[PDB]
Amino acid sequence: MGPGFDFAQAIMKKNTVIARTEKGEFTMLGVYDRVAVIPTHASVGEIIYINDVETRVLDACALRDLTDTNLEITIVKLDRNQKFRDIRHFLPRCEDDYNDAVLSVHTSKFPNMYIPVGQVTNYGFLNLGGTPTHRILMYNFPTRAGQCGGVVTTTGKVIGIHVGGNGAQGFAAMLLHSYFTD
Ligand SMILES: C[C@H]1CN(c2ncccc2F)CC(=O)N1
């Protein structure tokens, strides 16, 4: 509809795949080369399905901050024959608040879904399904099951991935430039 959805659409069309684990189907953001992110609660194993193709997992790392607290981001390297467009320059360097964000989802259940979630607060600490979690973004939209891995964008920035909600609000794990330095 507007320049927010334009940027979101550009990311979804080139930098997402449909990831299936034993814990379900997730929106999965490809960041560069064969490196993608997914909520840690997807429980990535040795094998993952990527757009319904059996794919070896070459590496997977559940991120924690230096207080040894969950970040709910799993960085995955895929045995895929094709690289992602490099979008690391759209990642923020710092923890921040944002205006006018879009949450974008693409699964078998929710294809081509874009939600204007509005203002995004640096919420910080969240007890997420009973796990102390840091660097959480919050938006006042009543998000539902099927949206985990959803990409949260502003114009010009990919800021996080959807990891949960409480019926009234949704929560995203921050993405930071420092997570994907090579
Ligand atoms: C497909 C399903 C999802 N849905 C949602 N309702 C409320 C919050 C978040 C939602 F995704 C709208 C709808 O028509 N049904």
mmCIF file with all atom_site columns, C-alpha atoms and ligand atoms in Angstrom:
data_model
loop_
_atom_site.group_PDB
_atom_site.id
_atom_site.type_symbol
_atom_site.label_atom_id
_atom_site.label_alt_id
_atom_site.label_comp_id
_atom_site.label_asym_id
_atom_site.label_entity_id
_atom_site.label_seq_id
_atom_site.pdbx_PDB_ins_code
_atom_site.Cartn_x
_atom_site.Cartn_y
_atom_site.Cartn_z
_atom_site.occupancy
_atom_site.B_iso_or_equiv
_atom_site.pdbx_formal_charge
_atom_site.auth_seq_id
_atom_site.auth_comp_id
_atom_site.auth_asym_id
_atom_site.auth_atom_id
_atom_site.pdbx_PDB_model_num
ATOM   1   C CA  . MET A 1 1   ? 0.000  0.000   0.000  1.00 0.00 ? 1   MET A CA  1
ATOM   2   C CA  . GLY A 1 2   ? 2.804  2.454   1.051  1.00 0.00 ? 2   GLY A CA  1
ATOM   3   C CA  . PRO A 1 3   ? 6.640  2.682   1.336  1.00 0.00 ? 3   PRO A CA  1
ATOM   4   C CA  . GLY A 1 4   ? 6.658  0.509   4.525  1.00 0.00 ? 4   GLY A CA  1
ATOM   5   C CA  . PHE A 1 5   ? 5.036  -2.462  2.676  1.00 0.00 ? 5   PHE A CA  1
ATOM   6   C CA  . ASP A 1 6   ? 7.282  -1.765  -0.383 1.00 0.00 ? 6   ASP A CA  1
ATOM   7   C CA  . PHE A 1 7   ? 10.460 -2.404  1.691  1.00 0.00 ? 7   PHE A CA  1
ATOM   8   C CA  . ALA A 1 8   ? 8.878  -5.411  3.525  1.00 0.00 ? 8   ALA A CA  1
ATOM   9   C CA  . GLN A 1 9   ? 7.782  -6.900  0.140  1.00 0.00 ? 9   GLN A CA  1
ATOM   10  C CA  . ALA A 1 10  ? 11.362 -6.504  -1.267 1.00 0.00 ? 10  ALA A CA  1
ATOM   11  C CA  . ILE A 1 11  ? 12.799 -8.557  1.685  1.00 0.00 ? 11  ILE A CA  1
ATOM   12  C CA  . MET A 1 12  ? 10.072 -11.271 1.533  1.00 0.00 ? 12  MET A CA  1
ATOM   13  C CA  . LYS A 1 13  ? 10.398 -11.868 -2.276 1.00 0.00 ? 13  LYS A CA  1
ATOM   14  C CA  . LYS A 1 14  ? 14.248 -12.424 -2.233 1.00 0.00 ? 14  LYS A CA  1
ATOM   15  C CA  . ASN A 1 15  ? 15.346 -13.150 1.381  1.00 0.00 ? 15  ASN A CA  1
ATOM   16  C CA  . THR A 1 16  ? 12.774 -15.632 2.871  1.00 0.00 ? 16  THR A CA  1
ATOM   17  C CA  . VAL A 1 17  ? 12.287 -19.417 2.612  1.00 0.00 ? 17  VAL A CA  1
ATOM   18  C CA  . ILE A 1 18  ? 9.683  -21.683 4.298  1.00 0.00 ? 18  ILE A CA  1
ATOM   19  C CA  . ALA A 1 19  ? 11.487 -23.654 7.059  1.00 0.00 ? 19  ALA A CA  1
ATOM   20  C CA  . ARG A 1 20  ? 9.901  -26.852 8.503  1.00 0.00 ? 20  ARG A CA  1
ATOM   21  C CA  . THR A 1 21  ? 11.230 -28.546 11.695 1.00 0.00 ? 21  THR A CA  1
ATOM   22  C CA  . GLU A 1 22  ? 9.521  -31.154 13.950 1.00 0.00 ? 22  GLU A CA  1
ATOM   23  C CA  . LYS A 1 23  ? 8.060  -28.084 15.828 1.00 0.00 ? 23  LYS A CA  1
ATOM   24  C CA  . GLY A 1 24  ? 6.264  -26.785 12.625 1.00 0.00 ? 24  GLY A CA  1
ATOM   25  C CA  . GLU A 1 25  ? 6.521  -24.373 9.614  1.00 0.00 ? 25  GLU A CA  1
ATOM   26  C CA  . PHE A 1 26  ? 8.383  -21.019 10.152 1.00 0.00 ? 26  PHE A CA  1
ATOM   27  C CA  . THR A 1 27  ? 9.142  -17.860 8.129  1.00 0.00 ? 27  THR A CA  1
ATOM   28  C CA  . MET A 1 28  ? 12.975 -17.984 7.821  1.00 0.00 ? 28  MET A CA  1
ATOM   29  C CA  . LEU A 1 29  ? 15.027 -14.844 6.936  1.00 0.00 ? 29  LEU A CA  1
ATOM   30  C CA  . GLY A 1 30  ? 18.153 -15.461 4.759  1.00 0.00 ? 30  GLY A CA  1
ATOM   31  C CA  . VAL A 1 31  ? 20.787 -12.773 5.625  1.00 0.00 ? 31  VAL A CA  1
ATOM   32  C CA  . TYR A 1 32  ? 23.848 -13.599 3.401  1.00 0.00 ? 32  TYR A CA  1
ATOM   33  C CA  . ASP A 1 33  ? 25.572 -16.553 1.609  1.00 0.00 ? 33  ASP A CA  1
ATOM   34  C CA  . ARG A 1 34  ? 23.810 -19.713 3.028  1.00 0.00 ? 34  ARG A CA  1
ATOM   35  C CA  . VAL A 1 35  ? 23.182 -18.118 6.495  1.00 0.00 ? 35  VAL A CA  1
ATOM   36  C CA  . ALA A 1 36  ? 19.583 -17.714 7.801  1.00 0.00 ? 36  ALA A CA  1
ATOM   37  C CA  . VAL A 1 37  ? 17.895 -17.029 11.197 1.00 0.00 ? 37  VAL A CA  1
ATOM   38  C CA  . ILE A 1 38  ? 14.911 -18.747 12.934 1.00 0.00 ? 38  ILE A CA  1
ATOM   39  C CA  . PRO A 1 39  ? 13.461 -18.606 16.496 1.00 0.00 ? 39  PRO A CA  1
ATOM   40  C CA  . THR A 1 40  ? 15.455 -20.940 18.808 1.00 0.00 ? 40  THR A CA  1
ATOM   41  C CA  . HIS A 1 41  ? 12.087 -22.609 19.785 1.00 0.00 ? 41  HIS A CA  1
ATOM   42  C CA  . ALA A 1 42  ? 11.944 -24.163 16.206 1.00 0.00 ? 42  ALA A CA  1
ATOM   43  C CA  . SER A 1 43  ? 14.591 -26.651 17.586 1.00 0.00 ? 43  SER A CA  1
ATOM   44  C CA  . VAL A 1 44  ? 16.738 -26.905 14.384 1.00 0.00 ? 44  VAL A CA  1
ATOM   45  C CA  . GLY A 1 45  ? 18.377 -30.370 14.039 1.00 0.00 ? 45  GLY A CA  1
ATOM   46  C CA  . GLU A 1 46  ? 20.863 -31.971 11.552 1.00 0.00 ? 46  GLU A CA  1
ATOM   47  C CA  . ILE A 1 47  ? 18.182 -31.921 8.781  1.00 0.00 ? 47  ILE A CA  1
ATOM   48  C CA  . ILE A 1 48  ? 15.634 -29.144 7.974  1.00 0.00 ? 48  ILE A CA  1
ATOM   49  C CA  . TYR A 1 49  ? 13.054 -28.784 5.117  1.00 0.00 ? 49  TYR A CA  1
ATOM   50  C CA  . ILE A 1 50  ? 13.548 -25.589 3.028  1.00 0.00 ? 50  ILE A CA  1
ATOM   51  C CA  . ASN A 1 51  ? 10.637 -24.908 0.615  1.00 0.00 ? 51  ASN A CA  1
ATOM   52  C CA  . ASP A 1 52  ? 9.781  -28.689 1.089  1.00 0.00 ? 52  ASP A CA  1
ATOM   53  C CA  . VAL A 1 53  ? 13.355 -29.864 0.115  1.00 0.00 ? 53  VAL A CA  1
ATOM   54  C CA  . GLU A 1 54  ? 15.354 -32.013 2.606  1.00 0.00 ? 54  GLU A CA  1
ATOM   55  C CA  . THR A 1 55  ? 18.410 -29.826 3.516  1.00 0.00 ? 55  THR A CA  1
ATOM   56  C CA  . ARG A 1 56  ? 21.466 -30.764 5.673  1.00 0.00 ? 56  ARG A CA  1
ATOM   57  C CA  . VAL A 1 57  ? 22.200 -28.163 8.420  1.00 0.00 ? 57  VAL A CA  1
ATOM   58  C CA  . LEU A 1 58  ? 25.977 -27.399 8.238  1.00 0.00 ? 58  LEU A CA  1
ATOM   59  C CA  . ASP A 1 59  ? 25.877 -25.395 11.530 1.00 0.00 ? 59  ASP A CA  1
ATOM   60  C CA  . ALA A 1 60  ? 23.325 -23.977 14.019 1.00 0.00 ? 60  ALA A CA  1
ATOM   61  C CA  . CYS A 1 61  ? 24.015 -21.619 16.938 1.00 0.00 ? 61  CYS A CA  1
ATOM   62  C CA  . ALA A 1 62  ? 21.492 -20.541 19.588 1.00 0.00 ? 62  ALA A CA  1
ATOM   63  C CA  . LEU A 1 63  ? 22.616 -16.961 20.469 1.00 0.00 ? 63  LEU A CA  1
ATOM   64  C CA  . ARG A 1 64  ? 22.886 -15.857 24.137 1.00 0.00 ? 64  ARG A CA  1
ATOM   65  C CA  . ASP A 1 65  ? 24.076 -12.391 25.377 1.00 0.00 ? 65  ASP A CA  1
ATOM   66  C CA  . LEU A 1 66  ? 27.232 -12.054 27.549 1.00 0.00 ? 66  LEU A CA  1
ATOM   67  C CA  . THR A 1 67  ? 25.080 -12.256 30.768 1.00 0.00 ? 67  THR A CA  1
ATOM   68  C CA  . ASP A 1 68  ? 24.463 -15.857 29.383 1.00 0.00 ? 68  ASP A CA  1
ATOM   69  C CA  . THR A 1 69  ? 20.757 -15.006 28.715 1.00 0.00 ? 69  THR A CA  1
ATOM   70  C CA  . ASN A 1 70  ? 18.644 -16.451 25.837 1.00 0.00 ? 70  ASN A CA  1
ATOM   71  C CA  . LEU A 1 71  ? 18.290 -14.147 22.732 1.00 0.00 ? 71  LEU A CA  1
ATOM   72  C CA  . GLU A 1 72  ? 15.796 -16.579 20.981 1.00 0.00 ? 72  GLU A CA  1
ATOM   73  C CA  . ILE A 1 73  ? 17.783 -16.209 17.650 1.00 0.00 ? 73  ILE A CA  1
ATOM   74  C CA  . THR A 1 74  ? 19.245 -19.396 16.051 1.00 0.00 ? 74  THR A CA  1
ATOM   75  C CA  . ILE A 1 75  ? 21.732 -18.663 13.231 1.00 0.00 ? 75  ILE A CA  1
ATOM   76  C CA  . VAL A 1 76  ? 21.667 -21.527 10.697 1.00 0.00 ? 76  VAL A CA  1
ATOM   77  C CA  . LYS A 1 77  ? 24.009 -22.393 7.834  1.00 0.00 ? 77  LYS A CA  1
ATOM   78  C CA  . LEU A 1 78  ? 22.221 -24.440 5.098  1.00 0.00 ? 78  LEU A CA  1
ATOM   79  C CA  . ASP A 1 79  ? 23.693 -26.998 2.636  1.00 0.00 ? 79  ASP A CA  1
ATOM   80  C CA  . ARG A 1 80  ? 21.839 -25.128 -0.135 1.00 0.00 ? 80  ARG A CA  1
ATOM   81  C CA  . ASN A 1 81  ? 23.120 -24.731 -3.759 1.00 0.00 ? 81  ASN A CA  1
ATOM   82  C CA  . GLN A 1 82  ? 22.156 -21.001 -3.872 1.00 0.00 ? 82  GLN A CA  1
ATOM   83  C CA  . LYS A 1 83  ? 23.259 -17.884 -1.867 1.00 0.00 ? 83  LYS A CA  1
ATOM   84  C CA  . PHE A 1 84  ? 20.910 -15.258 -0.411 1.00 0.00 ? 84  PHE A CA  1
ATOM   85  C CA  . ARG A 1 85  ? 21.103 -11.624 -1.440 1.00 0.00 ? 85  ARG A CA  1
ATOM   86  C CA  . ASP A 1 86  ? 23.358 -9.980  1.199  1.00 0.00 ? 86  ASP A CA  1
ATOM   87  C CA  . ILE A 1 87  ? 21.061 -7.711  3.389  1.00 0.00 ? 87  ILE A CA  1
ATOM   88  C CA  . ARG A 1 88  ? 23.497 -7.239  6.332  1.00 0.00 ? 88  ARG A CA  1
ATOM   89  C CA  . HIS A 1 89  ? 23.675 -3.458  5.500  1.00 0.00 ? 89  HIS A CA  1
ATOM   90  C CA  . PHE A 1 90  ? 19.912 -3.219  6.384  1.00 0.00 ? 90  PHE A CA  1
ATOM   91  C CA  . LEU A 1 91  ? 20.573 -4.524  9.967  1.00 0.00 ? 91  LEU A CA  1
ATOM   92  C CA  . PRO A 1 92  ? 20.746 -1.976  12.810 1.00 0.00 ? 92  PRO A CA  1
ATOM   93  C CA  . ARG A 1 93  ? 24.027 -1.617  14.757 1.00 0.00 ? 93  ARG A CA  1
ATOM   94  C CA  . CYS A 1 94  ? 22.362 -0.684  18.145 1.00 0.00 ? 94  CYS A CA  1
ATOM   95  C CA  . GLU A 1 95  ? 19.317 -1.596  20.328 1.00 0.00 ? 95  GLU A CA  1
ATOM   96  C CA  . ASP A 1 96  ? 16.634 1.025   19.483 1.00 0.00 ? 96  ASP A CA  1
ATOM   97  C CA  . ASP A 1 97  ? 12.910 1.950   19.352 1.00 0.00 ? 97  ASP A CA  1
ATOM   98  C CA  . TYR A 1 98  ? 11.190 2.407   15.934 1.00 0.00 ? 98  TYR A CA  1
ATOM   99  C CA  . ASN A 1 99  ? 8.028  3.925   14.382 1.00 0.00 ? 99  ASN A CA  1
ATOM   100 C CA  . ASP A 1 100 ? 5.663  2.367   11.810 1.00 0.00 ? 100 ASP A CA  1
ATOM   101 C CA  . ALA A 1 101 ? 6.951  -1.270  11.545 1.00 0.00 ? 101 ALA A CA  1
ATOM   102 C CA  . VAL A 1 102 ? 5.610  -4.079  9.269  1.00 0.00 ? 102 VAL A CA  1
ATOM   103 C CA  . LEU A 1 103 ? 5.554  -7.760  10.324 1.00 0.00 ? 103 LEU A CA  1
ATOM   104 C CA  . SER A 1 104 ? 5.764  -10.009 7.193  1.00 0.00 ? 104 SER A CA  1
ATOM   105 C CA  . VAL A 1 105 ? 4.938  -13.786 7.194  1.00 0.00 ? 105 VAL A CA  1
ATOM   106 C CA  . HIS A 1 106 ? 5.105  -16.394 4.385  1.00 0.00 ? 106 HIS A CA  1
ATOM   107 C CA  . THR A 1 107 ? 4.043  -20.005 5.241  1.00 0.00 ? 107 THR A CA  1
ATOM   108 C CA  . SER A 1 108 ? 1.678  -22.600 3.607  1.00 0.00 ? 108 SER A CA  1
ATOM   109 C CA  . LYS A 1 109 ? -0.983 -21.368 6.156  1.00 0.00 ? 109 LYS A CA  1
ATOM   110 C CA  . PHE A 1 110 ? -0.209 -17.572 5.889  1.00 0.00 ? 110 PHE A CA  1
ATOM   111 C CA  . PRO A 1 111 ? 1.160  -16.783 2.387  1.00 0.00 ? 111 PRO A CA  1
ATOM   112 C CA  . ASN A 1 112 ? 1.895  -13.120 1.452  1.00 0.00 ? 112 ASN A CA  1
ATOM   113 C CA  . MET A 1 113 ? 0.822  -11.717 4.868  1.00 0.00 ? 113 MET A CA  1
ATOM   114 C CA  . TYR A 1 114 ? 1.882  -8.125  5.875  1.00 0.00 ? 114 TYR A CA  1
ATOM   115 C CA  . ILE A 1 115 ? 0.712  -6.532  9.221  1.00 0.00 ? 115 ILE A CA  1
ATOM   116 C CA  . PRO A 1 116 ? 1.190  -2.815  10.038 1.00 0.00 ? 116 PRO A CA  1
ATOM   117 C CA  . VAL A 1 117 ? 2.067  -3.315  13.757 1.00 0.00 ? 117 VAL A CA  1
ATOM   118 C CA  . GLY A 1 118 ? 2.836  0.424   14.431 1.00 0.00 ? 118 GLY A CA  1
ATOM   119 C CA  . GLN A 1 119 ? 5.335  1.702   17.078 1.00 0.00 ? 119 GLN A CA  1
ATOM   120 C CA  . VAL A 1 120 ? 8.055  -0.745  18.298 1.00 0.00 ? 120 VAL A CA  1
ATOM   121 C CA  . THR A 1 121 ? 9.421  -0.359  21.885 1.00 0.00 ? 121 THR A CA  1
ATOM   122 C CA  . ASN A 1 122 ? 12.830 -1.568  23.093 1.00 0.00 ? 122 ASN A CA  1
ATOM   123 C CA  . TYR A 1 123 ? 11.100 -3.744  25.743 1.00 0.00 ? 123 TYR A CA  1
ATOM   124 C CA  . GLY A 1 124 ? 14.284 -5.567  26.889 1.00 0.00 ? 124 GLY A CA  1
ATOM   125 C CA  . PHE A 1 125 ? 13.641 -8.408  29.350 1.00 0.00 ? 125 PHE A CA  1
ATOM   126 C CA  . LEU A 1 126 ? 10.774 -10.871 28.666 1.00 0.00 ? 126 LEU A CA  1
ATOM   127 C CA  . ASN A 1 127 ? 9.904  -14.198 30.307 1.00 0.00 ? 127 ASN A CA  1
ATOM   128 C CA  . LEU A 1 128 ? 9.116  -15.952 26.960 1.00 0.00 ? 128 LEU A CA  1
ATOM   129 C CA  . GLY A 1 129 ? 7.332  -19.323 27.461 1.00 0.00 ? 129 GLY A CA  1
ATOM   130 C CA  . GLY A 1 130 ? 9.094  -19.489 30.884 1.00 0.00 ? 130 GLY A CA  1
ATOM   131 C CA  . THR A 1 131 ? 12.652 -18.593 29.524 1.00 0.00 ? 131 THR A CA  1
ATOM   132 C CA  . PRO A 1 132 ? 14.387 -15.334 30.587 1.00 0.00 ? 132 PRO A CA  1
ATOM   133 C CA  . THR A 1 133 ? 15.021 -13.569 27.210 1.00 0.00 ? 133 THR A CA  1
ATOM   134 C CA  . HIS A 1 134 ? 16.855 -10.250 26.464 1.00 0.00 ? 134 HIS A CA  1
ATOM   135 C CA  . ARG A 1 135 ? 16.716 -7.685  23.570 1.00 0.00 ? 135 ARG A CA  1
ATOM   136 C CA  . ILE A 1 136 ? 12.932 -8.106  22.942 1.00 0.00 ? 136 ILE A CA  1
ATOM   137 C CA  . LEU A 1 137 ? 11.027 -5.622  20.717 1.00 0.00 ? 137 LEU A CA  1
ATOM   138 C CA  . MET A 1 138 ? 7.275  -5.146  21.544 1.00 0.00 ? 138 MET A CA  1
ATOM   139 C CA  . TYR A 1 139 ? 4.396  -3.975  19.287 1.00 0.00 ? 139 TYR A CA  1
ATOM   140 C CA  . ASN A 1 140 ? 0.701  -3.528  20.308 1.00 0.00 ? 140 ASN A CA  1
ATOM   141 C CA  . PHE A 1 141 ? -0.804 -5.924  17.739 1.00 0.00 ? 141 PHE A CA  1
ATOM   142 C CA  . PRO A 1 142 ? -2.614 -9.128  18.833 1.00 0.00 ? 142 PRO A CA  1
ATOM   143 C CA  . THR A 1 143 ? -0.394 -11.558 16.821 1.00 0.00 ? 143 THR A CA  1
ATOM   144 C CA  . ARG A 1 144 ? -1.404 -15.293 16.622 1.00 0.00 ? 144 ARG A CA  1
ATOM   145 C CA  . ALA A 1 145 ? 0.200  -18.760 16.183 1.00 0.00 ? 145 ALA A CA  1
ATOM   146 C CA  . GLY A 1 146 ? 1.846  -19.305 12.713 1.00 0.00 ? 146 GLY A CA  1
ATOM   147 C CA  . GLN A 1 147 ? 3.736  -15.907 12.707 1.00 0.00 ? 147 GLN A CA  1
ATOM   148 C CA  . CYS A 1 148 ? 7.013  -16.982 14.474 1.00 0.00 ? 148 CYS A CA  1
ATOM   149 C CA  . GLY A 1 149 ? 10.021 -16.152 12.269 1.00 0.00 ? 149 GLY A CA  1
ATOM   150 C CA  . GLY A 1 150 ? 7.954  -13.282 10.781 1.00 0.00 ? 150 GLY A CA  1
ATOM   151 C CA  . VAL A 1 151 ? 10.261 -10.430 9.623  1.00 0.00 ? 151 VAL A CA  1
ATOM   152 C CA  . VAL A 1 152 ? 9.886  -7.000  11.349 1.00 0.00 ? 152 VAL A CA  1
ATOM   153 C CA  . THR A 1 153 ? 11.002 -4.101  9.070  1.00 0.00 ? 153 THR A CA  1
ATOM   154 C CA  . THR A 1 154 ? 10.871 -0.296  8.932  1.00 0.00 ? 154 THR A CA  1
ATOM   155 C CA  . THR A 1 155 ? 11.647 1.547   5.654  1.00 0.00 ? 155 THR A CA  1
ATOM   156 C CA  . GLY A 1 156 ? 15.368 0.814   5.142  1.00 0.00 ? 156 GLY A CA  1
ATOM   157 C CA  . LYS A 1 157 ? 15.860 -1.540  8.184  1.00 0.00 ? 157 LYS A CA  1
ATOM   158 C CA  . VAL A 1 158 ? 15.302 -5.239  9.067  1.00 0.00 ? 158 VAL A CA  1
ATOM   159 C CA  . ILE A 1 159 ? 15.069 -4.951  12.889 1.00 0.00 ? 159 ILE A CA  1
ATOM   160 C CA  . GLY A 1 160 ? 13.896 -8.374  14.209 1.00 0.00 ? 160 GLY A CA  1
ATOM   161 C CA  . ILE A 1 161 ? 12.066 -11.705 13.925 1.00 0.00 ? 161 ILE A CA  1
ATOM   162 C CA  . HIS A 1 162 ? 8.688  -12.494 15.599 1.00 0.00 ? 162 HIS A CA  1
ATOM   163 C CA  . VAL A 1 163 ? 9.145  -14.961 18.540 1.00 0.00 ? 163 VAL A CA  1
ATOM   164 C CA  . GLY A 1 164 ? 5.789  -14.741 20.512 1.00 0.00 ? 164 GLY A CA  1
ATOM   165 C CA  . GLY A 1 165 ? 2.796  -12.785 21.922 1.00 0.00 ? 165 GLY A CA  1
ATOM   166 C CA  . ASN A 1 166 ? 0.351  -12.596 24.907 1.00 0.00 ? 166 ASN A CA  1
ATOM   167 C CA  . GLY A 1 167 ? -2.918 -12.057 22.926 1.00 0.00 ? 167 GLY A CA  1
ATOM   168 C CA  . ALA A 1 168 ? -2.677 -8.190  23.146 1.00 0.00 ? 168 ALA A CA  1
ATOM   169 C CA  . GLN A 1 169 ? 1.021  -7.709  22.126 1.00 0.00 ? 169 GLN A CA  1
ATOM   170 C CA  . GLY A 1 170 ? 3.638  -9.392  19.882 1.00 0.00 ? 170 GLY A CA  1
ATOM   171 C CA  . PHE A 1 171 ? 7.380  -9.747  20.635 1.00 0.00 ? 171 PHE A CA  1
ATOM   172 C CA  . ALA A 1 172 ? 10.386 -9.920  18.291 1.00 0.00 ? 172 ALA A CA  1
ATOM   173 C CA  . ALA A 1 173 ? 14.043 -10.871 18.923 1.00 0.00 ? 173 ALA A CA  1
ATOM   174 C CA  . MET A 1 174 ? 16.342 -8.006  17.778 1.00 0.00 ? 174 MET A CA  1
ATOM   175 C CA  . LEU A 1 175 ? 18.589 -8.560  14.782 1.00 0.00 ? 175 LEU A CA  1
ATOM   176 C CA  . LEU A 1 176 ? 21.925 -6.699  15.116 1.00 0.00 ? 176 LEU A CA  1
ATOM   177 C CA  . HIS A 1 177 ? 24.731 -6.192  12.487 1.00 0.00 ? 177 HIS A CA  1
ATOM   178 C CA  . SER A 1 178 ? 27.271 -7.688  15.009 1.00 0.00 ? 178 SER A CA  1
ATOM   179 C CA  . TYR A 1 179 ? 25.484 -11.133 14.889 1.00 0.00 ? 179 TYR A CA  1
ATOM   180 C CA  . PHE A 1 180 ? 26.594 -11.668 11.185 1.00 0.00 ? 180 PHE A CA  1
ATOM   181 C CA  . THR A 1 181 ? 30.158 -10.209 11.026 1.00 0.00 ? 181 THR A CA  1
ATOM   182 C CA  . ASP A 1 182 ? 32.436 -12.625 9.018  1.00 0.00 ? 182 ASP A CA  1
HETATM 183 C C1  . LIG B 2 .   ? -5.926 -15.848 8.687  1.00 0.00 ? 1   LIG B C1  1
HETATM 184 C C2  . LIG B 2 .   ? -6.344 -15.450 10.092 1.00 0.00 ? 1   LIG B C2  1
HETATM 185 C C3  . LIG B 2 .   ? -5.288 -14.429 10.754 1.00 0.00 ? 1   LIG B C3  1
HETATM 186 N N1  . LIG B 2 .   ? -5.947 -13.223 11.263 1.00 0.00 ? 1   LIG B N1  1
HETATM 187 C C4  . LIG B 2 .   ? -5.466 -12.532 12.370 1.00 0.00 ? 1   LIG B C4  1
HETATM 188 N N2  . LIG B 2 .   ? -6.374 -12.001 13.211 1.00 0.00 ? 1   LIG B N2  1
HETATM 189 C C5  . LIG B 2 .   ? -5.946 -11.302 14.275 1.00 0.00 ? 1   LIG B C5  1
HETATM 190 C C6  . LIG B 2 .   ? -4.616 -11.084 14.565 1.00 0.00 ? 1   LIG B C6  1
HETATM 191 C C7  . LIG B 2 .   ? -3.659 -11.629 13.729 1.00 0.00 ? 1   LIG B C7  1
HETATM 192 C C8  . LIG B 2 .   ? -4.082 -12.347 12.638 1.00 0.00 ? 1   LIG B C8  1
HETATM 193 F F1  . LIG B 2 .   ? -3.151 -12.893 11.828 1.00 0.00 ? 1   LIG B F1  1
HETATM 194 C C9  . LIG B 2 .   ? -6.919 -12.583 10.380 1.00 0.00 ? 1   LIG B C9  1
HETATM 195 C C10 . LIG B 2 .   ? -7.805 -13.578 9.693  1.00 0.00 ? 1   LIG B C10 1
HETATM 196 O O1  . LIG B 2 .   ? -8.606 -13.222 8.838  1.00 0.00 ? 1   LIG B O1  1
HETATM 197 N N3  . LIG B 2 .   ? -7.650 -14.856 10.028 1.00 0.00 ? 1   LIG B N3  1
#
